[PDB]
């Protein structure tokens, strides 16, 4: 079965964070020490920043970002570089949707951007994989949940947005899109694992529910205008997937009917699935071959099940085909959540770079 | 010699019959044979039995961490939290009253295991003789791990499951553990021959942590809860406050000696003696491990003071600053709570419940 492609988020581009002079002055003025006595530590932090803002786009890249994020917390605990504080310096980053530089004299803006990039990087690692195996689906699911975790942490701990790409409404979209993709990975896995058809239907139904939340944000004219050109691409994929996974949910409810030997119910579910799938195909116009191939394969599957079921029923069982509205709807089975981040886990940060600054 | 350290006892576990609930949830929600996961259930059952009867050694820490992580793995597959479908009674004994407290919440089981990990670390830290630099480092690390466990509890369970885990009591625990960790590093810094001013600042931070603990101990609610424990802890802690203040001023006096400030040297050694005499008073009834420490320190500070006074009275003739003029030693924090990541794959081993969901 050809898998659907996944959306990922680009990393923000960093400008300057000239922390050195401010740290040197605070050391002299507050700690009463030679301003130059911490050139080693400053040098280590600068090299770590350079590595993080140019992070390698791979799994090892995630630990570089976590290490730098943590060292930023350590530095803030020793030298006051927050909003309005004595040793604060300009921090500049590029806002994703506009490409404009946004500056704040606040080291927590630097932390927020780094956390954002950790989420973006996780989204890339999750979306770049081909998901051919159970393990691949599981690891991708984990990356999407880590991405959701980063964006949810940002959303919760940084309520006043430093820039619109990090505003509450946009982060909420990111979270729902990432949980949708995580749940989609587990749907694929549940099929590989041969779970009961009814359970597979609930899992797929929840994929639909997450994509519906994300689609709502994409359809929000205000939210949309913040995104710009990228709204159109994301919306097309998401809206198509809403119909696709609703069709998959009904395909599996029909499979349950087949197992229960309810041959009229079988027809009704497969008919609904075909209807939903046909809508997905209309919505997919212009989409890449990865999408077209997924849909073609599914059309062969659902079309075949439907014909077979309609034939068994028309020639043999002659059972009434229930009105869909007389069938208990499928409730989503949520299997995913945003995975928490501890920015100051000693395991990720290593020793405090400024441990000697006391 | 080395001062004795405080450690905390481990909580006693009651029942946590998770099996029937997991089987029932699987049958209802997955539609699968409820016996399909017996191997997984038995593995968690054996891990629990090991964790609740944990060996009092470093290995025991890994067993508690493993179980704690596996409990997280289970909860992410099967809803056993407060008010959730598969939740079952979890029972543990409250440490101070010895009474059973129950909650239908897997998070309560997790909290108690974390509490025990913190208590085990405190025991391991307190156990060592701290003869060598190595022992001082390992003890320092245990105390910081203990502080980390209690701090994690305090942050992630703001609504205590029982009174032994209230925010007030957990803060006492963290401060006590940090004070002890900083004390181990103070011992190391001396064996390392660090500069006198630094040693002085390390000692003043020991004082700072113990002052925070002392304040919590002097709270009437803490006293009624801890009973005799509160008096035992309070006497040791108050004594160490004066002892480590004396050690701080001893080292400020040695810095003065190094800077040829011979009047200031006398003032600092005099202050050190006065604080040490207050410590000796507060140490009545303490074991010889404590008395021997105080006597040794008195002989050192005593000799250093007599020598400084003699030098100043007969040679240097410098003004001796009034104690009140002595600028306060700022504490140098060198320790911190070392938080656990409950689901660190390095401590959990493979996910026992990988086949669920």
Look at residues B252, B233, B176, B245 and name the one whose alpha carbon lies nearest to residue B207: B245
Is the CB of residue A92 less than 8 Å from the CB of residue A15? yes
Is the CB of residue A338 less than 8 Å from the CB of residue A148? yes
Strands, sheet with A101-104, edge to edge from the N-terminal-most edge strand: A14-17, A91-94, A101-104
Nearest chain B Cα distance for residue A346, angstroms: 7
CA gap A86, B16 in Å, rounded: 53
Is the CB of residue A294 less than 8 Å from the CB of residue A2? yes
Nearest chain A Cα distance for residue B299, angstroms: 31
Residues of A with CB under 8 A from a CB of B: 186, 190, 195-196, 198-199, 333, 335, 337, 342, 344-347, 355, 358
Residue of A196, A335, A355 lying closest to B31 (CB–CB): A196
Chain B hits for A337, CB-CB cut-off 8 Å, are 76
Task: Give the count of beta carbons closer than 10 Å to the beta carbon of residue B126.
Answer: 18
The sign of the dihedral angle between the CA atoms of A111, A115, A116, A121 is positive
Interface touch B339/A335, C-beta < 8 Å: no
CA gap B217, B233 in Å, rounded: 8
Interface touch A342/B338, C-beta < 8 Å: no
Expressed in angstroms, the distance from the first to the final Cα of chain B is 57
CA gap B242, B233 in Å, rounded: 15
Paired strand residues for B103: B90
Residue of B30, B76, B341 lying closest to A347 (CB–CB): B341
Interface touch B29/A346, C-beta < 8 Å: no
Interface touch B29/A198, C-beta < 8 Å: no
With 0-12 CB in 10 A as exposed, 13-18 as middle and 19+ as buried, what is A23?
buried
**CB contact burial A99-112 (16+ within 10 A = b; e otherwise):** eeebebebbbbbbb
Is the CB of residue A137 less than 8 Å from the CB of residue A131? yes
Residue that has been written with the tokens 């925070």 in this structure: B212
Is the CB of residue A184 less than 8 Å from the CB of residue A245? yes
Retrieve residue A60's tokens. Answer: 């090892």
CA gap A129, A112 in Å, rounded: 27
CA gap A169, A173 in Å, rounded: 6
Look at residues A126, A130, A184, A129 and name the one whose alpha carbon lies nearest to residue A150: A126
Look at residues B96, B71, B88, B111 and name the one whose alpha carbon lies nearest to residue B23: B88
A23: Cβ contacts below 8 Å, ≥ 6 apart = A38, A42, A75, A79, A87
Paired strand residues for B13: B92
Look at residues A31, A36, A37, A61 and name the one whose alpha carbon lies nearest to residue A348: A61
Q: At what angle do helices B106-127 and B58-75 cross, to 10 degrees?
A: 170
Interface touch A198/B31, C-beta < 8 Å: yes
CA gap A230, B113 in Å, rounded: 48
DSSP B132: S
A75: Cβ contacts below 8 Å, ≥ 6 apart = A19, A23, A45, A81, A107, A353, A354
DSSP string over B140-206: HHHHHHHHHHHHHHHHH-SS-SSGGG-HHHHHHHHHHHHHHHHHHHHHHHHHTT--HHHHHHHHHHH
The helix/strand/coil state of A101 is strand
Q: Which residue of B has its CA nearest to A336?
A: B76
Residue that has been written with the tokens 């007969």 in this structure: B314
Nearest chain B Cα distance for residue A33, angstroms: 13
Look at residues B125, B143, B69 and name the one whose alpha carbon lies nearest to residue B342: B69
Q: Which of A205, A346, A349 to mutate to test the interface with B (most CBs of B within 10 A)?
A: A346
Kindly state the helix (H) or strand (E) to which residue A160 belongs, with its residue range.
none
Is the CB of residue B88 less than 8 Å from the CB of residue B16? yes
The helix/strand/coil state of B339 is coil
Pairing of strands B100-103, B90-93: antiparallel
∠ Cα A239 A135 B342 (to 5°): 100
Nearest chain B Cα distance for residue A58, angstroms: 20
Retrieve residue B123's tokens. Answer: 């025991």
CA gap B226, B8 in Å, rounded: 12
Retrieve residue A236's tokens. Answer: 């097309």
Look at residues A106, A104, A107 and name the one whose alpha carbon lies nearest to residue A75: A107
Look at residues B281, B328, B276 and name the one whose alpha carbon lies nearest to residue B301: B276
Q: Which of B27, B354, B357 to mutate to test the interface with A (most CBs of A within 10 A)?
A: B357
Look at residues B286, B199, B307, B309 and name the one whose alpha carbon lies nearest to residue B239: B286
Chain A hits for B201, CB-CB cut-off 8 Å, are 358
DSSP string over A164-207: GGGSHHHHHHHHHHHHHHHHHHHHHHHHHTT--HHHHHHHHHHH
Chain A hits for B333, CB-CB cut-off 8 Å, are 358
Measured in angstroms, the resolution is: 2.0
Residue of B30, B76, B339 lying closest to A345 (CB–CB): B339
| Helical residues (DSSP H) of chain A, grouped into ranges | 20-29, 39-53, 59-78, 107-128, 134-157, 168-192, 197-219, 221-227, 230-259, 263-283, 289-312, 346-349
Retrieve residue B312's tokens. Answer: 């100043």
Chain A hits for B339, CB-CB cut-off 8 Å, are 342, 344-346
The helix/strand/coil state of A103 is strand
Look at residues A27, A119, A40, A126 and name the one whose alpha carbon lies nearest to residue A80: A27
CA gap A317, A315 in Å, rounded: 7
CA gap B96, B91 in Å, rounded: 15
CA gap A158, A160 in Å, rounded: 6
Retrieve residue A357's tokens. Answer: 């600054």
Interface touch A196/B30, C-beta < 8 Å: yes
Alpha carbon distances (Å) from A41 to A51, A79, B45, B303: 15, 13, 48, 41
Interface touch B339/A342, C-beta < 8 Å: yes
CA gap B256, B253 in Å, rounded: 5
* Torsion angle in degrees (nearest 10) through CA of B302, B308, B314, B320: -110
Chain A hits for B79, CB-CB cut-off 8 Å, are none
- The values of phi and psi at residue B102, to 5°, are -120, 145
CA gap B65, B343 in Å, rounded: 9
Retrieve residue A310's tokens. Answer: 């309609």
Nearest chain B Cα distance for residue A337, angstroms: 9
Interface touch B344/A347, C-beta < 8 Å: yes
∠ Cα B356 B340 B152 (to 5°): 105
Pairing of strands A91-94, A101-104: antiparallel
Residue of B30, B339, B344 lying closest to A195 (CB–CB): B30
Nearest chain A Cα distance for residue B93, angstroms: 30
Chain A hits for B332, CB-CB cut-off 8 Å, are 358
With 0-12 CB in 10 A as exposed, 13-18 as middle and 19+ as buried, what is B332?
buried
Retrieve residue B71's tokens. Answer: 């409990």
∠ Cα A166 A168 A171 (to 5°): 60
Alpha carbon distances (Å) from B294 to A303, A343, B165, B266, B291: 89, 43, 34, 20, 5
CATH number, span A1-358 = 1.25.40.280
Expressed in angstroms, the distance from the first to the final Cα of chain A is 60
The helix/strand/coil state of A6 is coil
CA gap A211, A244 in Å, rounded: 11
CA gap A127, A141 in Å, rounded: 10
The CATH topology of domain B1-357 is 1.25.40
A36: Cβ contacts below 8 Å, ≥ 6 apart = A24
The helix/strand/coil state of B91 is strand
Look at residues B329, B340, B353, B342 and name the one whose alpha carbon lies nearest to residue B268: B329
Retrieve residue B217's tokens. Answer: 């101990």
Interface touch A196/B344, C-beta < 8 Å: no
Alpha carbon distances (Å) from B216 to B35, B101, B154, B335, B337: 51, 24, 15, 20, 18
Interface touch B30/A199, C-beta < 8 Å: yes
Alpha carbon distances (Å) from B129 to B5, B133, B151, B241, B284: 10, 11, 26, 21, 23
CA gap B241, B74 in Å, rounded: 45
Nearest chain A Cα distance for residue B283, angstroms: 31
CA gap B337, B325 in Å, rounded: 35
Total beta-carbon pairs less than 8 A apart between chain A and chain B: 27
Nearest chain A Cα distance for residue B294, angstroms: 29
Nearest chain B Cα distance for residue A243, angstroms: 24
CA gap B286, B318 in Å, rounded: 39
Is the CB of residue B257 less than 8 Å from the CB of residue B195? no
| Helical residues (DSSP H) of chain B, grouped into ranges | 19-25, 38-52, 58-75, 106-127, 133-156, 167-191, 196-217, 220-226, 228-258, 262-282, 288-311, 345-348
Is the CB of residue B266 less than 8 Å from the CB of residue B312? yes
Retrieve residue B262's tokens. Answer: 């011979």
A52: Cβ contacts below 8 Å, ≥ 6 apart = A64, A65, A67, A68, A114, A117
Task: Give the count of beta carbons closer than 10 Å to the beta carbon of residue A199.
Answer: 19
Chain A hits for B76, CB-CB cut-off 8 Å, are 337
Integer-rounded Cα radius of gyration of chain B: 25
∠ Cα B32 B33 B35 (to 5°): 135
Retrieve residue A96's tokens. Answer: 């994703």
Is the CB of residue A126 less than 8 Å from the CB of residue A147? yes
Look at residues A139, A125, A176 and name the one whose alpha carbon lies nearest to residue A155: A176
- The values of phi and psi at residue B91, to 5°, are -125, 130
Task: Domain ranges for chain B, please list them.
Answer: 1-357
CA gap B68, B316 in Å, rounded: 64
Interface touch B344/A344, C-beta < 8 Å: no
Task: Give the count of beta carbons closer than 10 Å to the beta carbon of residue A342.
Answer: 16
Kindly state the helix (H) or strand (E) to which residue A350 belongs, with its residue range.
none
Kindly state the helix (H) or strand (E) to which residue B89 belongs, with its residue range.
none
Task: Give the count of beta carbons closer than 10 Å to the beta carbon of residue A311.
Answer: 11
Paired strand residues for A14: A93
Residue that has been written with the tokens 């669920």 in this structure: B356
Look at residues B285, B279, B191, B190 and name the one whose alpha carbon lies nearest to residue B237: B279
CA gap B57, B64 in Å, rounded: 11
Chain B hits for A190, CB-CB cut-off 8 Å, are 357
Residue of A196, A333, A346 lying closest to B32 (CB–CB): A196
DSSP B13: B
**CB contact burial B135-153 (16+ within 10 A = b; e otherwise):** bbebbbbbbbbbbbbbbbb
Look at residues A49, A81, A109, A45 and name the one whose alpha carbon lies nearest to residue A352: A45
Retrieve residue B193's tokens. Answer: 């021959």
* Torsion angle in degrees (nearest 10) through CA of A247, A248, A249, A255: 110
B46: Cβ contacts below 8 Å, ≥ 6 apart = none
Retrieve residue A30's tokens. Answer: 């507050």
CA gap B278, B273 in Å, rounded: 9
Characterise A332 by phi-psi region: left (phi > 0), alpha (psi -120 to 50), beta (else).
beta
- The values of phi and psi at residue B334, to 5°, are -120, 5
A159: Cβ contacts below 8 Å, ≥ 6 apart = A168
């Amino acid at each position: 079965v050809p898998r659907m492609p996944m959306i990922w988020l680009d990393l923000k581009e960093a400008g300057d964070f000239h922390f050195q002079p401010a740290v040197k002055k605070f050391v002299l003025k507050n700690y009463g020490e030679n301003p130059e006595a911490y050139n080693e530590e400053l040098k280590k932090l600068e090299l770590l920043r350079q590595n993080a803002v140019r992070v390698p786009r791979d799994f090892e890249g995630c630990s570089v970002l976590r290490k730098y994020l943590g060292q930023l917390h350590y530095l803030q605990s020793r030298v006051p570089m927050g909003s309005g504080q004595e040793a604060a310096v300009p921090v500049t980053w590029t806002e994703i949707f506009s490409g404009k530089s946004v500056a704040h004299e606040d080291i927590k803006y630097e932390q927020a951007c780094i956390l954002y990039n950790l989420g973006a990087l996780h989204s890339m690692l999750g979306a770049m994989d081909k998901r051919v195996s159970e393990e691949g689906m599981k690891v991708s699911c984990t990356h999407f949940q880590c991405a959701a975790g980063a964006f949810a942490y940002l959303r919760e701990h940084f309520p006043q947005a430093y820039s619109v790409d990090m505003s509450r409404q946009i982060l909420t979209l990111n979270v729902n899109l990432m949980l949708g993709q995580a749940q989609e990975c587990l749907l694929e896995k549940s099929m590989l694992d041969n779970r009961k058809s009814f359970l597979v239907a609930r899992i797929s139904a929840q994929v639909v529910d997450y994509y519906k939340e994300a689609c709502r944000a994409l359809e929000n004219p205000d939210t949309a205008s913040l995104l710009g050109r990228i709204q159109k691409d994301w919306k097309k994929l998401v809206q198509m997937k809403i119909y696709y996974f609703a069709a998959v949910a009904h395909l599996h409810m029909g499979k349950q009917a087949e197992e229960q030997q309810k041959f009229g119910e079988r027809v009704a579910y497969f008919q609904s699935a075909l209807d939903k799938l046909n809508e997905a195909i209309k919505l997919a116009k212009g989409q890449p071959d990865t999408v077209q191939d997924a849909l073609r394969f599914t059309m062969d599957v659902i079309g075949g099940k439907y014909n077979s079921a309609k034939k068994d029923n028309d020639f043999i069982y002659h059972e009434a085909v229930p009105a869909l509205d007389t069938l208990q709807p499928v409730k989503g089975a949520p299997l995913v959540k945003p995975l928490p981040v501890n920015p100051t886990d000693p395991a990720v940060t290593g020793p405090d770079i400024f441990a000697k600054l006391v």
